[PDB]
Write a protein that binds this DNA or RNA. Sequence first.
RNA 1: CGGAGCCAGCGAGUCUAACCUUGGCCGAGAGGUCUUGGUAAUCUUGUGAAACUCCGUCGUGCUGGGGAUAGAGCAUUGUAAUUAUUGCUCUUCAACGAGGAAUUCCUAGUAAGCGCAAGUCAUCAGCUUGCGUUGAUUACGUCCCUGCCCUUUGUACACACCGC
Lengths: 104, 271, 37, 114, 63
Amino acid sequence: SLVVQEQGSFQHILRLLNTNVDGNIKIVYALTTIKGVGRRYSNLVCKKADVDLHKRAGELTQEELERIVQIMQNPTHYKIPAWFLNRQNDITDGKDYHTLANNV
Amino acid sequence: TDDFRVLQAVEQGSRSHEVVPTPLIHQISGMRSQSGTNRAISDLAKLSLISKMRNVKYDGYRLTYNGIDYLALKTMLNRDTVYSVGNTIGVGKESDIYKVSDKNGNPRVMKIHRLQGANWMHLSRLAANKEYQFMSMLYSKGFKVPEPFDNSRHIVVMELIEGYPMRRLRKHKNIPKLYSDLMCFIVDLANSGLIHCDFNEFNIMIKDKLEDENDCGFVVIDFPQCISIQHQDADYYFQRDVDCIRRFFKKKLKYEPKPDSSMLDTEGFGD
Amino acid sequence: QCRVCSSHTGLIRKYGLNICRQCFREKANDIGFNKFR
Amino acid sequence: SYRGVDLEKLLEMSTEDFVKLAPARVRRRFARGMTSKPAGFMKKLRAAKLAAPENEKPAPVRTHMRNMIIVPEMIGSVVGIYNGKAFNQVEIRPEMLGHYLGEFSITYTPVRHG
Amino acid sequence: LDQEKYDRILKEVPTYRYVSVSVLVDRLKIGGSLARIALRHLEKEGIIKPISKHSKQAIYTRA
RNA sequence: CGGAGCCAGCGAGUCUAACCUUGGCCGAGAGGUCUUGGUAAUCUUGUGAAACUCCGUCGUGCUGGGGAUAGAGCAUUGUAAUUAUUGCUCUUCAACGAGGAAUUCCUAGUAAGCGCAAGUCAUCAGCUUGCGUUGAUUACGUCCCUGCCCUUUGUACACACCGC
């Protein structure tokens, strides 16, 4: 494609949800680094956030990190239904949880 | 005492001729009547301790692997050894390894050798004697190695050692001293005049005493691979030992040598 | 389950005929599967 | 809480409403049927619950039906579950709902090597 | 870091008589993914000339 | 990995029962609903299998290889699934960087890779058998090892002495 070149402006290692993320992989496979989040989960989250996933995680603005975190604490409000989450139909609360990385 | 003595007598009625007929086992025993000899031979044959070869006009008795070890047990009743038999850990090629126990209750290792009529037995005997003498040479030189108890004509009974192989050992803290150890020990091998070509991961056995005093040792079992330095191909054998240590410490322990390793030309000024 | 002569050892359980491999080769010359190649 | 529900509200529920709060295994278990004899066993169970002194533990009832879902009808009973050889008496807790009776009785001795 | 990786492609590709997928990652500046983007971009510019194209390896020539 | 192309054959199928199922709707799927065809070179079936072909994503990093282990729920057969029968969804991502002493099989569509069908089949295979797709290297020599025999005949010391 078109070689879109950036004069610096990317950070090597970002940190999100209290966990270090390498800002050089694709954003799916850079957010796969944290616990409780796999390939298809980060993929569907960034498709609901409309993130270009052929772009690396160094070329990602923190506003999209805020969007990804908003889908983290709101998966069921952003049209990602109950089959896709970690703890569906709990016994303690009866709800559907997606247990995050450092909150296990 | 008496039945074991007569079974020792027919053991000694084997080193006279080839495949032994019936009246020689009658008369070498020198017992009273037809009863003891014939019912003993039938007890042998029903327990497969003896076999019948009937070559024309000629009865004969064929000893298999079964009816020997009792005498070895009797030979080891003489030498204070094993009372209880049987726990399978390892069925090797030229030996079958069992875990046994004495009257004292300590577990030991019983390597029976199966390498018929005389030659299977006798070559198992030569193998056991050769390995016992090699163990004696290693312990006399001072190599850390299991201590031999006895070599009951073709069955070697030795100690048990609390070790596990290095393939399941992730690393230790003192990796460069372990590399200097596994270099200097092959140096000591070349200073013995020998090269153990199978110096692999499954050979080297580590006993683990503590985590503070660090007073431990090693166990090296490479017996049908040790080759004298005078032979045709010992150069790359030594180099395979050195380089298997180095490639394991690069692959597993992620350690590269800062001092250069010894060559065969380095160790030619040794022994 | 052998429903002919109580001969569970080696049932041929295919197609419900249920004959043991001993008695199947007894009755092999009644059905027609015989030796050609 | 079983689904975020208070304990005494759970206690007075029927079997079918507990199926309405059940996982898929319990729902499909009860949807196919149940034998007539555990109804009389539950009548014996509630009679022994009626043979309980105040502020104490009830009469322990011995049980073979290890595959029964613990429904909140049976919370609080002291039940001796049969493991194949012997009976083991456990108080049924609200932490035990949705489970088989076979999950709370060890059927064999442990194996000691080292 | 845009003006001190990108133009070395424009110096090296006219130097090299043979430009393919993994004889252009070898300069140790770039990844193996964006290298093919630079390949197609030099196809569009014209310094890279197509010889043959496959979905795993593509053969080109300098201009 | 993500799309696309979509190539076979051996089988096998229901009665006084619930077999093989085409198609249409619902469901992310598992699956469910409603029927229809076939007792069979007819319907399933042209079994549109897998490996394969092409194009994009990846970029050598225990990696986007691996999928062991574990959590959560949802469905199917079975009276009964707990030590989970099994299927589906998300998550947890372990040893394992071409493997020792030693070991097995093999000469053309054979090996090897691949899946499918039939029996085990109430549910699943990593069990067994046949089928078809792609399709090497290298012998066509030997008894040197391993043995297996086939023989030739030096012979029984025809059982001798002893030291012991």
